[PDB]
Every structure is written in structure tokens, then in C-alpha cells.
């Protein structure tokens, strides 16, 4: 046996339960934005402890396991996926991924072990990078007009959310600047899988 302390075990979630959260399939960027807004609007946790995390790569083909779109027989290959990360004071980070079949929220190390998995034997073009944006900056800066979800014929790929598009004074659309894993573009910091797990893993 092996045993560590001190530790974090009565963690109260920063969000409502999964089934009470704002959610539209295939609008993870917005689902995460709405989690960030909830946290900002409540007095449980400081917003400074929370991050939006975009997962993608140059080829926009990233596997994630433990996904509701294909349970039991992962991975799902996404163009990008977005989750919320909360760094709690208890010694410990948590992932809030409304699309996971893991718990909501899930301990960071579990999510990385079971949903992300190692890149070591993954074909290099499918390896994962992580853009980590402070929640306050994500709320300040993110904008999407949803135009990436409307095909050539003007049909929606998946139904858009019913509330108005997220826009800022500076932009009506900058989604690509968050999907990008070019560290010279956009906001926040871009990490390799190893760097990401080094920063947040226990």
C-alpha cells in the first residue's frame, strides 16, 4: 500500500450537476463558456482558479476516450474539444466535461489517464495539444458567430444553442484563434501533453 496526505476529499462541485447545465452537443466551446459564467456569477470559487482548455492539433484530429458519443468503444476523433479545469486549493485539479462518460466533475489525473491516455504510441499526427485560457480571459475575449456549423447549403450540422451568439466589442468570431495550437496566436498558453500534465497533474 501507499499513502499520501494532506488531501482534498469533500470537494464541492463548481457547477450544477451534469443534467442541470446548459448544453448543446457539438458546441463544447459555448458549453464551457456557460460553466465559466456560472462560476463568475456565484461566490463559491474564485474565477482565477478556473480555465477553459481547448484540445486540438494542427490536423484537427484528436482522439478522446470515455466519450458519450461512443461509449465502450472509444476513441471519438474530434476536430477540437473544450473542457473546464478547476484547480482547487485542496491539492488537486478537476475536469468538467459534459461530453465524458467519466464523472462530472472528474479528478484531473483520472481524466488524463482514462480519457486522454498516453501519446507515446499514438500516430504523431493525432497527438494532443492543449490551449489553456484563464476563465476570466475566456469570458472577456471569446466570440463565436456559429458560422463554422452551417454547411455550404446553409444547413446546420447540429442545432445551434437558443441563446444569442457570444460576441465581444472586438470580435464577432474568433473561434479559430482558440482551436489553433500556434502559441503565437490567441489567448492563453499552448502546452504539449507532457507539459499540460506537468502543470496540473498530481
Strand order of the largest sheet: 6-5-4-1-7-8
SS element count, helices: 5
The multimeric state of the shown protein is monomer
What's the total number of strands? 8
- What's the architecture, going by CATH? Roll
State the major sheet. Answer: 6 strands, antiparallel
Domains counted in the coordinates: how many?
A: 1
SSE arrangement, N to C: HEEEEEEHEHHEH
Span of the ends, CA to CA: 18 Å
Structural class by sheet pairing and helices: alpha+beta
CATH C-level name: Alpha Beta
Protein name: Protein N-terminal glutamine amidohydrolase
EC number: 3.5.1.122
Main location: cytoplasm
Organism: Homo sapiens (Human)
List the keywords.
alpha+beta, protein structure initiative, hydrolase, C8orf32 fold, center for eukaryotic structural genomics, PSI-2, 21% helix, cesg, 202 residues, two-stranded antiparallel ribbon, 19% strand
What does this structure look like?
The PDB classes it as hydrolase. Keywords: protein structure initiative, PSI-2, center for eukaryotic structural genomics, cesg, structural genomics, glutamine aminohydrolase, hNTAQ1, hydrolase. The chain is an alpha+beta fold and 202 residues long. It has a single domain, classed as C8orf32 fold (Roll), CATH 3.10.620. The chain is built from 5 helices and 8 strands. It has helices at 28-41, 108-116, 135-141, 176-179, 193-200, and strands at residues 50-56, 62-64, 76-78, 81-88, 92-96, 106-107, 129-134, 189-192. It has a 6-stranded antiparallel beta sheet with strand order 6-5-4-1-7-8, with helices on both faces. A two-stranded antiparallel ribbon has the order 2-3. Helix 1 crosses helix 3 (135-141).
Amino acid at each position: 500500500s501507499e499513502g499520501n496526505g494532506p488531501a482534498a476529499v469533500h470537494y464541492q462541485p463548481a457547477s450544477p450537476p451534469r443534467d442541470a447545465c446548459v448544453y448543446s452537443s457539438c458546441y463544447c466551446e459555448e458549453n464551457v463558456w456557460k460553466l465559466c459564467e456560472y462560476i463568475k456569477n456565484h461566490d463559491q470559487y474564485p474565477l482565477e482558479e478556473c480555465y477553459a482548455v481547448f484540445i486540438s492539433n494542427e490536423r484537427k484530429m484528436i482522439p478522446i476516450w470515455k466519450q458519450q458519443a461512443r461509449p465502450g468503444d472509444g476513441p471519438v476523433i474530434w476536430d477540437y474539444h473544450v473542457v473546464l479545469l478547476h484547480v482547487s486549493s485542496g491539492g488537486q485539479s478537476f475536469i468538467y466535461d459534459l461530453d465524458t462518460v467519466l464523472p462530472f466533475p472528474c479528478l484531473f489525473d483520472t481524466y488524463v489517464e482514462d480519457a486522454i491516455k498516453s501519446d507515446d504510441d499514438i500516430h504523431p499526427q493525432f497527438r494532443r495539444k492543449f490551449r489553456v485560457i484563464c476563465a476570466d480571459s475566456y469570458l472577456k475575449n471569446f466570440a463565436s458567430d456559429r458560422s463554422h456549423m452551417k454547411d455550404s447549403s446553409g444547413n446546420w450540422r447540429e442545432p445551434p444553442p437558443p441563446y444569442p451568439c457570444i460576441e465581444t466589442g472586438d470580435s464577432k468570431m474568433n473561434l479559430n484563434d482558440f482551436i489553433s495550437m500556434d502559441p503565437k496566436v490567441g489567448w492563453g498558453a499552448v502546452y504539449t501533453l507532457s507539459e499540460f500534465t506537468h502543470r496540473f497533474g498530481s
